[PDB]
């Protein structure tokens, strides 16, 4: 359609994949986490789950006090849960012509190259392979210009969003990289372009 509320849909999809809301808690997402144990998680000022990727064994042990299978699952989630990075590359920042097929290359990356793209959770039993959503839209207007989904089995690749540029003057474009699988990995990067 072109409607930027696609973002909301994407967010929802993450919830479905996992089984928890976008606002509720990033930390409850992890396979076999609970509010009792989330008391001790907020103790160490853990906002994002990327904090759990940088933590080490002793702390982890202190935190979780459960059976081994659950622990293993958690570990798996952590490992295949990737720290991705967002960098774009425009062809011609001078020659911005309105109403033209303006291709824009986007080189993306992961933390660790996936052994497989096996999405894990607890509450969603049926197996899923991880997908991503590259997005481009004007935030105030809510008009989505460029979208593509990807299956990132390399550690780093380049993807081109064959999009049509907006009308004349300034346009404050913004990008996302929403994992359809996992909550709270919404990497973004806004920028300007002046069109004639």
UniProtKB/Swiss-Prot annotation:
Annotated ranges, domain SEC63: 1-193
Localization of this protein: Nucleus
Organism domain of life: Eukaryota
Role description: RNA helicase that plays an essential role in pre-mRNA splicing as component of the U5 snRNP and U4/U6-U5 tri-snRNP complexes. Involved in spliceosome assembly, activation and disassembly. Mediates changes in the dynamic network of RNA-RNA interactions in the spliceosome. Catalyzes the ATP-dependent unwinding of U4/U6 RNA duplices, an essential step in the assembly of a catalytically active spliceosome.
UniProt free text on domains: Contains two helicase domains. The N-terminal helicase domain has catalytic activity by itself, contrary to the C-terminal helicase domain that may have a regulatory role and enhance the activity of the first helicase domain.
The protein's assembly and partners: Component of the U4/U6-U5 tri-snRNP complex composed of the U4, U6 and U5 snRNAs and at least PRP3, PRP4, PRP6, PRP8, PRP18, PRP31, PRP38, SNU13, SNU23, SNU66, SNU114, SPP381, SMB1, SMD1, SMD2, SMD3, SMX2, SMX3, LSM2, LSM3, LSM4, LSM5, LSM6, LSM7, LSM8, BRR2 and DIB1. Interaction with PRP8 is important for recruitment to the U4/U6-U5 tri-snRNP complex.
UniProt family annotation: Belongs to the helicase family. SKI2 subfamily.
More info: Present with 1440 molecules/cell in log phase SD medium.
Protein known as: Pre-mRNA-splicing helicase BRR2
UniProt source species: Saccharomyces cerevisiae (strain ATCC 204508 / S288c) (Baker's yeast)
Span of the entire protein shown here: 1968 to 2163 of 2163
